[PDB]
Design a protein around this motif. Structure first.
Motif, PDB file in Angstrom:
ATOM      1  N   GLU A  79      12.297  -0.758  -3.561  1.00 19.98           N
ATOM      2  CA  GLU A  79      10.847  -0.865  -3.495  1.00 19.98           C
ATOM      3  C   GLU A  79      10.196   0.496  -3.690  1.00 19.98           C
ATOM      4  OE1 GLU A  79       9.209  -2.546  -0.046  1.00 19.98           O
ATOM      5  OE2 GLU A  79       9.742  -4.619  -0.467  1.00 19.98           O
ATOM      6  N   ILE A  83       7.454   1.208  -6.573  1.00 20.56           N
ATOM      7  CA  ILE A  83       6.075   1.491  -6.213  1.00 20.56           C
ATOM      8  C   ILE A  83       5.705   2.908  -6.625  1.00 20.56           C
ATOM      9  CG2 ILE A  83       6.317  -0.152  -4.342  1.00 20.56           C
ATOM     10  CD1 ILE A  83       6.545   2.139  -2.442  1.00 20.56           C
ATOM     11  N   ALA A  86       5.170   2.823 -11.111  1.00 23.93           N
ATOM     12  CA  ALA A  86       3.802   2.794 -11.600  1.00 23.93           C
ATOM     13  C   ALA A  86       3.238   4.184 -11.816  1.00 23.93           C
ATOM     14  CB  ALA A  86       2.915   2.026 -10.620  1.00 23.93           C
ATOM     15  N   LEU A  87       3.733   5.177 -11.084  1.00 24.39           N
ATOM     16  CA  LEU A  87       3.269   6.542 -11.240  1.00 24.39           C
ATOM     17  C   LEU A  87       3.856   7.090 -12.528  1.00 24.39           C
ATOM     18  CD1 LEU A  87       3.880   7.519  -7.549  1.00 24.39           C
ATOM     19  CD2 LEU A  87       1.994   6.150  -8.583  1.00 24.39           C
ATOM     20  N   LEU A 118       5.311   6.192   2.133  1.00 17.34           N
ATOM     21  CA  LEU A 118       5.723   4.813   2.313  1.00 17.34           C
ATOM     22  C   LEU A 118       7.119   4.912   2.892  1.00 17.34           C
ATOM     23  CD1 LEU A 118       4.116   4.023  -1.049  1.00 17.34           C
ATOM     24  CD2 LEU A 118       3.202   3.769   1.252  1.00 17.34           C
ATOM     25  N   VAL A 120       6.708   3.487   6.218  1.00 17.07           N
ATOM     26  CA  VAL A 120       6.225   2.621   7.288  1.00 17.07           C
ATOM     27  C   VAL A 120       6.713   1.179   7.179  1.00 17.07           C
ATOM     28  CG1 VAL A 120       4.077   1.794   6.268  1.00 17.07           C
ATOM     29  CG2 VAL A 120       4.225   2.172   8.743  1.00 17.07           C
ATOM     30  N   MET A 122       6.071  -2.778   8.352  1.00 13.87           N
ATOM     31  CA  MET A 122       5.027  -3.677   8.811  1.00 13.87           C
ATOM     32  C   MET A 122       5.399  -4.306  10.146  1.00 13.87           C
ATOM     33  SD  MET A 122       3.784  -5.464   5.265  1.00 13.87           S
ATOM     34  CE  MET A 122       2.341  -5.996   6.184  1.00 13.87           C
TER      35      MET A 122
ATOM     36  N   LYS C   1      -5.570   5.791 -12.249  1.00 14.54           N
ATOM     37  CA  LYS C   1      -5.190   4.394 -12.352  1.00 14.54           C
ATOM     38  C   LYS C   1      -4.878   3.819 -10.966  1.00 14.54           C
ATOM     39  CE  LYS C   1      -2.248   5.482 -15.597  1.00 14.54           C
ATOM     40  NZ  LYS C   1      -2.820   6.789 -16.050  1.00 14.54           N
ATOM     41  N   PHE C   2      -4.157   2.700 -10.894  1.00 16.82           N
ATOM     42  CA  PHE C   2      -4.157   1.867  -9.695  1.00 16.82           C
ATOM     43  C   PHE C   2      -2.735   1.505  -9.313  1.00 16.82           C
ATOM     44  CE2 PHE C   2      -7.415   0.531 -12.782  1.00 16.82           C
ATOM     45  CZ  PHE C   2      -8.521   1.085 -12.200  1.00 16.82           C
ATOM     46  N   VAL C   3      -2.453   1.437  -8.015  1.00 16.83           N
ATOM     47  CA  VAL C   3      -1.242   0.797  -7.511  1.00 16.83           C
ATOM     48  C   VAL C   3      -1.621   0.046  -6.241  1.00 16.83           C
ATOM     49  CG1 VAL C   3       1.228   1.117  -7.014  1.00 16.83           C
ATOM     50  CG2 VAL C   3      -0.023   2.883  -8.276  1.00 16.83           C
ATOM     51  N   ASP C   5       0.915  -1.918  -2.661  1.00 11.30           N
ATOM     52  CA  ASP C   5       2.177  -2.494  -2.220  1.00 11.30           C
ATOM     53  C   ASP C   5       1.892  -3.688  -1.340  1.00 11.30           C
ATOM     54  OD1 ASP C   5       4.621  -3.290  -1.243  1.00 11.30           O
ATOM     55  OD2 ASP C   5       5.139  -1.360  -0.376  1.00 11.30           O
ATOM     56  N   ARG C   7       4.470  -4.983   0.357  1.00 13.57           N
ATOM     57  CA  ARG C   7       5.144  -4.722   1.622  1.00 13.57           C
ATOM     58  C   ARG C   7       4.118  -4.315   2.656  1.00 13.57           C
ATOM     59  NH1 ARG C   7       7.101  -0.393   4.727  1.00 13.57           N
ATOM     60  NH2 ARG C   7       6.380   1.083   3.126  1.00 13.57           N
ATOM     61  N   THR C   8       3.386  -3.253   2.357  1.00 13.65           N
ATOM     62  CA  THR C   8       2.298  -2.752   3.169  1.00 13.65           C
ATOM     63  C   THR C   8       1.003  -3.493   2.944  1.00 13.65           C
ATOM     64  OG1 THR C   8       1.750  -1.191   1.453  1.00 13.65           O
ATOM     65  CG2 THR C   8       3.314  -0.489   3.147  1.00 13.65           C
ATOM     66  N   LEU C  12      -2.867   1.871  -3.608  1.00 16.00           N
ATOM     67  CA  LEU C  12      -2.493   3.236  -3.900  1.00 16.00           C
ATOM     68  C   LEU C  12      -3.377   3.614  -5.072  1.00 16.00           C
ATOM     69  CD1 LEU C  12       1.251   2.328  -3.622  1.00 16.00           C
ATOM     70  CD2 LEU C  12      -0.457   2.698  -1.882  1.00 16.00           C
TER      71      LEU C  12
END
Lengths: 136, 54, 48
Positions: A79, A83, A86-87, A118, A120, A122, C1-3, C5, C7-8, C12
């Motif tokens: 993950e 996540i 995308a960067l 990230l 953390v 939930m 741009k955009f992100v 998650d 999960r959270t 972003l």
């Protein structure tokens, strides 16, 4: 004398014109030869061979890039991968669940920042619930 | 003062080759001895008088 | 741009502190949760 010093970050042929500027700036007898195995050769007066090795090491020390390994205890590495993907480099292992990094100690600063960002986990959502029927 | 020193500063946002003409304008605006060299690793090199290097 | 998650469940962002101003604005803009619509209803039949 000749001095042999490294620039690992990018091939040192990139410095040939400006280094021959210090081969031009003062007297010749110099060589600066760039081995595709990536080390660095100067030959000449220790002073101009120094300033040359200072430009050279100024592309050595400049752009530093290597690998990190840091535990991801919570957020699935794959993950973390996605996540960050995308960067617009990065590794991780989900044997260990750890971000690995390839790149800057600026990438080390900001990507220890995102090592931490990230991580953390939930809080439980009570996704499922057991209900005790009174009558029905 | 008038001393000649080199300054290494960053622009992360976009590659600094974009500033080569106008920066050489300040290499032209006053005396030379300067360099401004743009490393594709994205840092920034100046060399020259601390005022014009500023 | 955009992100983001899920999960959270967190936006972003990649971009400006103007993107930080306006996209904290849109951080806030669609955070709202619709009120329950009584989508389903249990009806007590009197006779039938």
């Amino acid at each position: 004398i000749t001095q042999v010093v490294a620039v690992k970050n990018v091939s040192v042929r990139e410095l040939s014109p400006l280094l021959r500027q210090l081969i031009d700036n003062a007297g010749a007898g110099n060589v600066v030869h760039y081995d595709p195995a990536n080390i660095i050769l100067i030959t000449g007066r220790a002073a101009v061979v120094n300033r040359l090795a200072e430009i050279i090491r100024r592309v050595d020390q400049a752009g530093d890039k290597e690998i990190e390994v840091v535990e991801l205890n919570n957020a699935s590495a794959a993950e973390m991968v996605r996540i960050v993907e995308a960067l617009n480099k990065f590794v991780a292992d989900e044997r260990t669940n750890s971000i690995l990094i390839s790149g800057d100690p600026k990438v080390r600063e900001r990507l220890k920042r995102l090592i931490k960002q990230l991580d953390v986990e939930m809080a439980a959502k009570g996704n499922n619930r057991v209900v005790y029927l009174k009558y029905a | 003062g008038d001393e000649v020193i080199t300054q290494v500063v960053a622009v992360k946002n976009v590659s600094v080759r974009e500033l080569s003409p106008l920066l050489r304008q300040l290499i032209d605006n006053a005396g030379a001895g300067n360099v401004v060299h743009y490393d594709p690793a994205n840092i920034i090199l100046i060399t020259g008088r601390a005022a014009v290097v500023n």
